[PDB]
């Protein structure tokens, strides 16, 4: 074939800031009403690519997995490219005139004007809204949250005086008592990962222990030291029992004796740790939240403070309800909303729509023609964050600016620009921001603020006051609703809300706990499964199948749900249900997957009483992980206890394998018939996981699939367990409640009659076991079995110590997937690039901008592998060689995004021959430990030890 003709287009007029081949970084922020963070945007010659974290003295809000995958919304070809009016394509001038004339009529008639939004923490946006209201006599501004937290806000407001949340510092407490907290999840915008993990490292003989009380099962439960299955009717009583101990009081708590046996212990210990303890609870009752405030004041702990309150969640379930009622009751005129989606998130949306039928000039700002854009008057085309200007105040004492990084792709207009035009203010929102920037920024205007991204503002603690908490305690103890089976709604790490309905990276991203993808489900405990005859099963092709079930509530039902029998998932008499998947407007049927459940969020309560019935058919699941338990293989995750760590020699908790010589024992690593190669000079690399800091390691996955151009595979072809992932997080349950209980059944064994029955019972996980996580990638071995058998010699090793993988000689005779004992090697099977069988972002022309040009895209028949960050470390050596310097201490660690994007300090990358780096101080430790040292493969990635107590 002739081979195509390649052309190149230089500029007519080249801008000073752009150099071809040189990446640029911009300081921006994000806040979409649910998630928020401070971050850097890496851009090419004109466009944004993979999101980095902003760490310039304001590294308080790193990006989560949902934020890292948000770039696909920018390059989504399914966006409202042009605004519509009355269902037809129209100009913005048409929109402007329509809105202005309706406002004039509302003023003349004396009607109602309502703006709807969501937690716009912005000094200048709020000011602008205030100006709108000042000019318009009858404007009400109202805030609507999908998942609400108004009970917490009421408790804080009525004590301290404002609607804000307490930003707890989990690194300043030794005893954490959690009652339905879930602070490692989405609880109050969970960003407490680093705070928690920091206190889990045994630096000396100290370690913060965690007490988990809960109905569901979550990551904080998995990361807890103690976990007590408890229903919501028990949790309320347990909270009062805690209160009576920390705060001397006599309130008649009704609680199960076995529960009291543990609740009392925890409460007494909490009390003992004066100033070093913390009570956190997620009970949807203001009275319960008030008791939490009372107890934390009594403890007077360092983790509790009102000096920097959180401005992120400021809604109200009373105001929203009033709004809905008035839309149907009275006459409401022009309603304008932005980022608000009641149809589908509102449980009473049927009445909301009937309210919409009674209002005039409904204006909705969005990215897609969703369910509310449909039922409206004007569909306004909004910009996607990187196409707009703004400013955000996450906490009480901070100010930050948001820069656009790409010029508007589609014909959009900012919400604030619309407000300025109807107010009669000349210019635009950017000019407005400039004029109002000096009110906060006392330093240099742009040069030291836009350049860095943030600005520091002082603050002060809020005054408290007298309040009858004893009364609240008696109200909570008297409160009681003990009936039948109930469910609890929750959000996921891959699915926070409906802003990522068609995001293929989050659809593919498997659940960190249940290990499944591309679907919703119902969590039922095994004790309940036996009563309802529900079950799951592994089929011949390797995937999972399971029964269907029906959920019935007061005056309603679902009629078809997909249950997963998670053994310890539910305590007893409770059901877990994820909320946020059932979307149908403006998206393809491949993305229209799952169950919504928002209709069950009656009166904004997450806890509902239900009836569960077994259905008729059977469902197939795209399940990623097969086996649930660990077979007693202590040579995989070594665990011990704190007092053993402190009092016993390493020989008793971190023992390495021995091999016999001339009637003598020696460390297995000393036996070798071959000769080694000299890698003592020139940058020998390693990589360090410590298992205490591994909470869920959620956002570490998506950042590794950002440079490396790993394609997206659908529900099928993952259902057959043939997915493409370079690093994976594991999930190991236990039988009989401990990991040491799965090592006493195995070491005590008999001959061939009992060993056919014990190894068949050790794959059924018992009730309330212990959970352990383990990140597994391709540790670049030295005596690597995947090397020697490649007939076409596509793999080799370097002097630095990698496993170099050429994508050229790999003529796919699939040997090297077999000799890897860890077996992390992903052959590709179809062509994932441009065919119509995979209609994801790799196919369409508008969505092939996420792909960086520095890493090639594989075609067919070649294998791929989690290499070390070659495309960054070959640039760090490059940028340290042109200058004439030596590479710094933390310069290798900040470039490889396998380590430079995780929340906690779990992943540590860097140099070893440099004896002053962070890796060389971790390799010389009493917890030095490799996977499978008896194999004799010499890996370059070492894990430490779980040191739970």
């Amino acid at each position: 074939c002739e081979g195509p003709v390649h052309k190149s287009i230089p500029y007519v007029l080249q801008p000073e800031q752009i150099i071809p081949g040189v990446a640029d970084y911009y300081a921006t922020t994000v806040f979409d009403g649910f998630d928020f963070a401070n971050l850097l945007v890496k851009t090419r010659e004109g466009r944004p690519i993979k999101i980095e974290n902003n760490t310039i003295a304001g590294a308080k809000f790193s990006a989560n997995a949902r934020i890292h995958a948000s770039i696909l919304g920018l390059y989504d070809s399914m966006r409202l490219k042009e605004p519509k009016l009355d269902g037809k394509n129209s100009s913005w001038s048409a929109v402007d005139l329509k809105i202005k004339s309706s406002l004039a009529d509302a003023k003349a008639k004396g009607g109602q004007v309502v703006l709807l939004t969501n937690t716009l923490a912005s000094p200048t946006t709020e000011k602008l809204i205030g100006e709108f209201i000042a000019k318009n006599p009858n404007a009400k501004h109202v805030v609507y949250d999908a998942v609400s937290s108004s009970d917490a806000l009421d408790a804080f407001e009525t004590v301290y005086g404002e609607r804000a949340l307490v930003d707890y510092d989990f690194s300043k407490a030794s005893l954490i008592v959690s009652v339905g907290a879930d602070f490692l999840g989405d609880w109050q915008g969970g960003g407490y990962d680093a705070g928690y993990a920091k206190g889990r490292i045994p630096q000396n003989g100290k370690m913060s222990r965690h007490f988990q009380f809960e109905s569901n099962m979550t990551l904080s439960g998995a990361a807890a030291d103690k976990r007590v299955p408890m229903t919501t009717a028990d949790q309320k009583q347990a909270l009062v029992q805690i209160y009576n101990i920390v705060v001397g009081a006599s309130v008649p708590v009704s609680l199960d004796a076995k529960f009291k046996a543990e609740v009392v212990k925890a409460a007494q210990q909490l009390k003992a740790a004066g100033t070093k303890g913390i009570l956190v609870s997620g009970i949807e009752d203001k009275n319960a939240q008030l008791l939490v405030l009372a107890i934390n004041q009594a403890l007077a702990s360092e983790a509790f403070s009102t000096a920097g309150t959180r401005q992120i969640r400021k809604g109200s379930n009373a105001v929203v309800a009033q709004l809905i009622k008035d839309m149907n009751a009275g006459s409401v005129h022009t309603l304008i909303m932005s980022g608000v989606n009641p149809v589908y998130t509102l449980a009473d949306s049927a009445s909301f729509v009937s309210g919409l039928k009674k209002v005039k000039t409904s204006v909705a700002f969005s990215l897609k023609e969703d369910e509310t854009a449909a039922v409206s008057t004007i569909a306004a085309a909004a910009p996607h964050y990187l196409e707009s200007w703004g400013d955000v105040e996450i906490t009480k004492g901070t100010y930050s600016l948001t820069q656009p990084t790409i010029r508007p792709i589609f014909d959009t207009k900012q919400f604030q620009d619309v407000l300025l035009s109807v107010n009669g203010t000349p210019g635009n929102f950017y000019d407005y921001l400039k004029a109002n920037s000096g009110a906060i920024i006392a330093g240099s205007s742009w040069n030291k603020v836009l350049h860095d991204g943030i600005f520091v503002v002082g603050s002060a603690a809020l005054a408290g006051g007298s309040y009858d908490f004893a009364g609240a305690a008696s109200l909570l103890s008297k409160a009681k609703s003990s009936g039948e089976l109930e469910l609890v709604l929750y959000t996921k790490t891959g699915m926070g809300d409906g802003q990522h309905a068609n995001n293929p990276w989050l659809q593919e991203f498997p659940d960190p706990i249940t290990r499944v993808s591309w679907d919703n489900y119902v969590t039922v405990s095994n004790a309940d499964a036996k009563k309802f005859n529900l079950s799951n099963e592994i089929v011949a092709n390797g995937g999972l199948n399971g029964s269907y079930a029906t959920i019935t509530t007061a005056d309603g039902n679902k009629l078809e749900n997909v249950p997963v029998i998670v053994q310890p998932g539910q305590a007893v008499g409770t059901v877990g249900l994820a909320v946020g998947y059932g979307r149908k407007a403006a998206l393809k049927e491949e993305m229209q997957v799952g169950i919504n459940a928002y209709a069950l969020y009656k009166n904004f309560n997450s806890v509902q009483s239900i009836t569960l019935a077994k259905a008729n058919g059977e469902h197939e699941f795209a399940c990623v992980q097969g086996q649930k338990t660990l077979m007693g293989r202590g040579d995989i995750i070594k665990e011990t206890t704190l007092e053993i760590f402190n009092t016993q020699d390493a020989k008793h908790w971190n023992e390495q394998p021995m091999v016999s010589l001339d009637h003598q024992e020696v460390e297995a690593t000393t036996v070798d018939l071959w000769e080694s190669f000299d890698r003592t000079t020139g940058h020998h690399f390693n990589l360090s996981i410590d298992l205490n800091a591994c909470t869920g390691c959620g956002a570490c996955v998506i950042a590794c699939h950002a440079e490396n151009n790993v394609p997206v595979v659908g529900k099928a072809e993952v259902r057959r367990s043939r997915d493409m992932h370079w690093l994976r997080i594991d999930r190991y349950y236990s039988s009989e409640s401990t990991f040491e209980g799965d090592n006493e059944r195995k070491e005590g064994i008999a001959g061939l009659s009992s060993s056919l029955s014990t190894f068949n019972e050790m794959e059924k996980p018992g009730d309330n076991p212990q959970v352990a996580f383990q990140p597994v990638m391709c540790q670049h071995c030295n005596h690597a079995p995947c090397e020697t058998v490649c007939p076409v010699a596509a793999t080799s090793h370097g002097r630095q110590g990698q496993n170099h993988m050429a994508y050229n000689r790999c003529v796919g005779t699939r040997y090297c997937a077999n000799n890897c004992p860890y077996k992390v090697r992903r052959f590709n099977w179809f062509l994932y690039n441009k065919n119509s069988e995979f209609d994801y972002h790799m196919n369409d022309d508008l969505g092939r901008m996420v792909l960086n040009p520095d890493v090639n895209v594989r075609s067919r028949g070649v294998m791929e592998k989690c290499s070390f960050c070659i495309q960054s470390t070959q640039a760090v050596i490059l940028e340290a060689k042109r200058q004439g310097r030596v590479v710094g201490k933390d310069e290798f660690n900040n470039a490889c995004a396998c380590s430079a994007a995780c929340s906690s300090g779990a992943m540590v990358f860097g140099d070893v021959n440099d004896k002053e780096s962070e890796v060389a101080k971790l390799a010389e430790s009493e917890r030095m430990y490799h996977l499978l040292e008896h194999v004799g493969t010499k890996p370059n990635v070492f894990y430490h030890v779980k040191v739970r107590n």
Partner: protein, 162 residues
């Protein structure tokens, strides 16, 4: 068979053309036909400050009076300021002399003065080297903001030898 006015034949081009977007090629989707779309006005990337003086006759002598060199003595005595003058400046101005160059001998275009005639401060080079005075052009596309100051110290050493 292989011709020289057209590229040669290939055997199964598996990974030869690009799925990603290498910088200067032609595409279809973008605003123009290019692949080098312009950044938004008013933004600031990490490691760059905008020049705060406007164009000539009102910002020229305001830059000539009060504007200084933000370098150190370790960087001036390095010889890298001479190498940038060896590339971007001998084509019109002289190398050791002033105004003799390479192109007033060949008489391609005239009107290049010396450095004895016009008194220039160390901040008046930097305003001309970014904008140009009626026959020069913006050399900001070629040199970087750290490197225009390395040239300006070398030009002052050339005037003192004259």
């Amino acid at each position: 068979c292989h011709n020289n006015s057209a590229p040669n034949y290939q055997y199964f081009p598996n990974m030869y053309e690009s799925v990603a977007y290498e910088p200067y090629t032609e595409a279809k989707i973008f605003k123009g036909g290019k692949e080098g779309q312009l950044p938004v006005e008013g933004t600031i990337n990490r490691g760059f400050e905008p020049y705060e003086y406007e164009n000539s006759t009102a910002g020229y002598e305001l830059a000539k009076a009060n504007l200084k060199s933000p370098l150190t003595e370790e960087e001036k005595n390095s010889g890298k300021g001479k190498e940038l003058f060896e590339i971007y400046c001998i084509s019109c101005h002289g190398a050791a002399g002033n105004g003799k160059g390479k192109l007033v001998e060949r008489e391609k275009f005239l009107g290049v003065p010396s450095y004895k005639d016009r008194e220039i401060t160390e901040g008046s080079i930097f305003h001309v080297e970014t904008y140009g005075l009626n026959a020069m052009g913006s050399h900001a596309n070629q040199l970087s903001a750290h490197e225009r100051w390395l040239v300006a110290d070398y030009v002052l050493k050339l005037k003192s030898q004259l």
